[PDB]
Amino acid sequence: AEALSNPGALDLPSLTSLLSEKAKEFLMENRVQSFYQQELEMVESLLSLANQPVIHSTTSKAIHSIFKNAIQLLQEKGLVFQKDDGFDNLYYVTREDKDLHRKIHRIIQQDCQKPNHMEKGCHFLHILACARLSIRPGLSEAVLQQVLELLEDQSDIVSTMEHYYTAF
């Protein structure tokens, strides 16, 4: 509550961290599926937080920079992702991509296409290798981890060993 009440006291990295947290809260509360960066810049509560003297010391570039860095923190955490689409400012929210969840679930249900003499289920890295071939070549470890956590929360998959998953 303190930082949010006086964000002008923060150094730029701390401010960027805080903006990223408030951006996450916005995206989750509104069940946003995809967004252009500029849409977050238009949320008054986010722009008011971001717009501190430290960002200014062009103006549009200063605002673009802090918002881009905040969104990238969410990307690094696997909460948002991009497609190879030529749209630098378009982002997708991992938790809202139902097709992605279903496809990862299917990969796991099918034991990552392993012959039936091998172990049921598959390792994180195997799932990732399959998903990059069949779904999205750029899929990060962090985005996959977020999908797996959601599937686990839904009791659709179970971890039987460290980083190893089978259908529930």
Author numbering: 190 to 246, 258 to 368
What is the paper's account of this structure, in its own sentences?
Like the scCST, the hCST (Ctc1, hStn1 and hTen1) complex is predicted to contain multiple OB-folds and it binds telomeric overhangs with high affinity and some specificity. To further elucidate the role of hCST at the telomeres, we solved the structures of hTen1 in complex with the N-terminal domain of hStn1 (hStn1N), and the C-terminal domain of hStn1 (hStn1C) alone.
The additional wHTH motif in hStn1 may allow interaction with a different set of proteins that function at telomeres such as Ctc1.
